[PDB]
Design a protein around this ligand. Structure first.
Ligand code: NAG
Lengths: 24, 50
């Protein structure tokens, strides 16, 4: 049995402060 | 054997791996802190970040 994830499961990839930025 | 050729003798090994992350430092050399300074042009070093 299943359901959809939508956009769950994103996490802070690194231990750095960044602000107002479209990082990749 | 104590009389093996050197290529066949036993050797002891240690390998040190260093965790250079932007996490908090916890293993550091014999370096010493100054007082902090603010609002003035300074040379600085934080945990080895010069
Ligand atoms: C994913 O779930 C939907 C129903 O929400 C279903 O139609 C689809 O076949 C499912 N696909 C997979 C690969 O599970």
């Amino acid at each position: 049995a299943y359901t959809n994830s939508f956009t769950r499961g994103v996490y802070y990839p690194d231990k750095v402060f960044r602000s107002s930025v479209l990082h990749s | 054997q104590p009389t093996n050729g050197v290529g066949y003798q036993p050797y002891r090994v240690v390998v040190l791996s260093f965790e250079l992350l932007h996490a908090p430092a916890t293993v550091c050399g014999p370096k010493k802190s100054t007082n902090l300074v603010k609002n003035k042009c300074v040379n600085f070093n934080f945990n080895g970040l010069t």
